[PDB]
Curated annotation (Swiss-Prot), chain A:
The gene is rpsG. One of the primary rRNA binding proteins, it binds directly to 16S rRNA where it nucleates assembly of the head domain of the 30S subunit. Is located at the subunit interface close to the decoding center, where it has been shown to contact mRNA. Has been shown to contact tRNA in both the P and E sites; it probably blocks exit of the E site tRNA. Part of the 30S ribosomal subunit. Contacts proteins S9 and S11. Cross-links to IF3 and the P and E site tRNAs. This is Small ribosomal subunit protein uS7. The strain K12 sequence is shown. Has been predicted to contact the N-terminal domain of IF-3 based on footprint studies; exactly how IF-3 interacts with the 30S subunit is controversial. One of its GO terms (cellular component) is membrane.
Amino acid sequence: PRRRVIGQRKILPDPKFGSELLAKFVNILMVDGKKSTAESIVYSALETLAQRSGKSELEAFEVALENVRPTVEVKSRRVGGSTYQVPVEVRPVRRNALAMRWIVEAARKRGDKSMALRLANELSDAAENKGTAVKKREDVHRMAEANKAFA
Amino acid sequence: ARIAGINIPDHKHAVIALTSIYGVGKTRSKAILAAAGIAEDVKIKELSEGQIDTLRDEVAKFVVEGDLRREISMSIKRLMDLGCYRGLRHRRR
RNA sequence: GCGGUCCGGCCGGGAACUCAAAGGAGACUGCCAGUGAUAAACUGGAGGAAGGUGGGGAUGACGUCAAGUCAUCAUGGCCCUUACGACCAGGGCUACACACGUGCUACAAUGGCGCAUACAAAGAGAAGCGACCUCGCGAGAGCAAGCGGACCUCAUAAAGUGCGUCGUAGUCCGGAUUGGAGUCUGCAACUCGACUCCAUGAAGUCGGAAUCGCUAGUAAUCGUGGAUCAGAAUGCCACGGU
C-alpha cells in the first residue's frame, strides 16, 4: 500500500430481499456497470421443494454459515516470498466477502445438469450438520499448527 | 420369449429392445411394430401370448436380423473385389 | 380508445401509449453535508422513464521502435526479352504403413426418439425473392403456379424436458484409416475433390520439462447465414442467441 487506498465498494444489496452479510456487492463474472438481470437464479437456494422439506424458508441461510467457520487460515497479501505467512487473525472483513462462495460449493458436489437435484442431498437431509457441510470446518484447523512459526 | 436373435429382451419394453441392433433403428421401429394392436407402455412380461408369435414373423420377413447380418448383409465387398472402380483407388493410399 | 373478422390490427378511424421521416429533445458531481492549502477533486443520499468519459461505435501522437506482410502493375527510376514472352493435351502448384502453420473430421459419463398454447427479433423487394393445395421414408433426383411485390424465402436450423440399457469396461460410451457400391455440380474421375450407407475397429481414462491464454455486453462445446454461387460455411464487414 505505497499509495493505493483500500476502499470496499458497495452499490446495492439484493433487490427482492437482502441481509447485512454482504461486505461488497458488485457485478463480476457478468457484464459490469449494468444491473438489468443479475438476480434470476441467485434466490434458488432457500428451499428447492416446499413439500419435500421440513425446515424454515428463511433460517436455512444461517444454518449453512455457522457450520462453515475457518478457525486459523493464511492471509492473501503474502508480501514476502517463499512460504512465510505472517500470523494475521481472521478479519471480520473476510467472513462476509468470500465466505458466501463456500456455501454454494458445499451444496454443489454430485455431478448433475440441474443444480436443484443437488439440494435434495445437501439440505433436505444434511442441514442438521450431517457431515457434508463440514468440509471447510475441520480442514482449516488441520492445516494450521504447521506454518504458525513463520514470519 | 426371445424376440431378438443375438440376446433376449429382459426387463425392457418392445421399442427399446429393437434399437441396438443394426437391422432396425429409429425409422424402422414405426413401420412394423404399429401395424397391430399392441401397447408400448406395458412391459413384455404383462402381454398376451397370442400376439407374440405374430410380431416375431414381422422382423424376420425381408428384415435382416443379427444372425443373418454376416450370412447375407455385407458379403458383397468380398464378391466385388475383382472389379476395379474409382472408389477403391482413392481409399487405398 | 372505439366497430365486423381469419383473431397475424385482415380495415371503418383516433393519440402522450412497445416504432417513426428535411429539423429541435435529452442525464454533464446538478445540489447539500463531510473531507480536502476556502480552489481542483473523491465516496453516499432528495427529484426522475435513463447517475458517475451513462453505455457502444465511428474515433488513432512517427515523442519509442532504421526491425511489420511489395504474390496491386516499376508504380516518373534503375531493370529483363525468341529457351523469365503465349493458346495448351500430356510430363503437372501430388499427405506415401496421413502430425495443431488459412477449411472442427475429432475431443468417445456432455450418448439417442411419435406426443391438443397469444408473443416474431433479422433479411428481401425492376436482368428477382417466390404464394397455397398436391407432393419429398437415406443422401441425390422433383411436382407447382398469384407476383416485376409491404403477400414469399434463405432457414428440414446443436442445447432443454426427461422410467431405461451400459459400469468405471480396451466397448452398446465411438465412429481416424486398412477394404467395397452410386447420384449430382459434369471436356473430364486416370492422377490430386465434396454430399450419404457400411464390418474388422487401430492409438486412449485428462496429460513430462520448457512455455503460455483469463476483468467496463467477462465465458465452454457435438451448432447457422443474406455473400464468389464448377464440387450449396466450421473459418465471421453480419444477424439471432439458453
